[PDB]
Amino acid sequence: ENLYFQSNAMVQIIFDSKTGNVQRFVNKTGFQQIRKVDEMDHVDTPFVLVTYTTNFGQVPASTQSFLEKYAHLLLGVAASGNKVWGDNFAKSADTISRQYQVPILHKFELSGTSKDVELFTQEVERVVTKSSAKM
Ligand SMILES: Cc1cc2nc3c(=O)[nH]c(=O)nc-3n(C[C@H](O)[C@H](O)[C@H](O)COP(=O)(O)O)c2cc1C
């Protein structure tokens, strides 16, 4: 666990959630700047996106709207899904990754496990270290 980095770094986490699983997931981290895609009218600092998956492995509409406006500051993406969907499992992360040329930080089920939290937070630190100065 890199809780010290999570709680001290200035990295921003922006998420999208409909039934609250993504919300619950990010609340398992120690990141301090956590806001939903719908509660800001501008983004001026680099950020990490955590979203969910809708019909047929699609990116939620609210996330697509957000990205076409602030994808220039996107560092990487993580997506919540459900393996019941097979090949469409958390496909929004793959779509966003290819579309905006950013790395996939993690793909997990529903609210995630402690293992998902660990992998996600470690990847955020790696990408911030590698792309912060650049971004
Ligand atoms: C209409 C609908 C379509 C969904 N489609 C997919 C899908 O294609 N792939 C997947 O992995 N999960 C799919 N899911 C599952 C959600 O991505 C999953 O439950 C997610 O954790 C929900 O996050 P929410 O609380 O953040 O918004 C779907 C759920 C609903 C209600």
UniProtKB/Swiss-Prot annotation:
GO terms for molecular function: FMN binding. InterPro entries: Flavoprotein-like_sf (IPR029039), RNR_Ib_NrdI_bac (IPR020852), RNR_NrdI (IPR004465). GO terms for biological process: protein modification process. Pfam families: Flavodoxin_NdrI. PANTHER family: PROTEIN NRDI (PTHR37297:SF1). Probably involved in ribonucleotide reductase function. This is Protein NrdI. It comes from Bacillus subtilis (strain 168).
